Amino acid sequence: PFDNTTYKNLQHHDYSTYTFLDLNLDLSKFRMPQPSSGRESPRH
């Protein structure tokens, strides 16, 4: 039903100190390979 009172952003009360990095680690298996500049480092 149409609700205009209850706050629906209640997921962020259960965020630990590793949530962002674990989410990034989960996303790291969905992404395309990165382009390469032809050297491993700028000083190589």
Partner: protein, 213 residues
């Protein structure tokens, strides 16, 4: 807060520090986020992860990051000293931060800071003797319509009063965690006298789309 380091017995290059294997996996994901040839672009998140593991940055996480990412350690020192979110000194468990910019100073954040100071028995930049709190003064934190406000670790406590924030500190001293949000009748950012706008339901998909799309 000095920008030069002296080798104390508690902070020396021989201080033991290393990443846990799951943190190594997160570090390798962070490195894989960036293009090849620019592995130095991951200095910020790996250093932040090292801080979240250790609680503070000695001079053993910086050289470990420099060895892992193959960069000169001077660049890691520059990055650590430039940014204010990197703790080069061991802070307490709860890092209280009170924002005293003009949009918060107009709504009397000084009363909140004074109440915290005379509750914990310390001053700005000082830690409790049992290493549980650390009170510093920061700039604007992006919640100016929720002024006054403080930030404790990753939690934003907004629309505070001296009695309410004294109760919040009491809750933290008992080991409990409070709810990171505004403490008045408002929920996130709406006016306290009800919704002036967006009282209509959203129209849903397919509304007002132009012809030919």
């Amino acid at each position: 807060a000095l920008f030069v380091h002296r080798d104390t017995p508690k902070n020396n290059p021989e201080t033991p520090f290393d990443f846990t294997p799951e943190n190594y996996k997160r570090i390798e994901a962070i490195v894989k986020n960036y293009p090849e040839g620019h592995k130095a672009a991951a200095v910020l998140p790996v250093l932040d992860l090292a801080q979240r593991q250790n609680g503070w940055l000695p001079i053993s996480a910086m050289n470990k990051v420099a060895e892992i990412l193959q960069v000169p350690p001077m660049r890691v020192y520059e990055v650590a000293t430039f940014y204010t979110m990197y703790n080069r000194k061991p802070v307490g468990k709860y890092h209280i931060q009170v924002c005293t910019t003009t949009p918060c100073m107009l709504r009397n954040s000084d009363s909140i800071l004074e109440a915290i100071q005379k509750k914990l028995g310390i001053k700005v930049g000082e830690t409790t003797p049992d290493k549980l709190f650390t009170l510093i003064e920061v700039e604007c934190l992006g919640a100016c319509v929720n002024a006054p406000m403080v930030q404790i670790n990753d939690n934003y406590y907004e629309d505070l009063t001296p009695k309410d924030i004294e109760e919040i500190i009491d809750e933290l001293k008992a080991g409990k965690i409070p709810k990171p949000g505004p403490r008045s009748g408002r929920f996130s950012c709406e006016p306290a006298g009800g919704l002036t706008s967006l009282t209509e339901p959203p129209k849903g998909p397919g509304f007002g789309v132009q012809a030919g799309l």
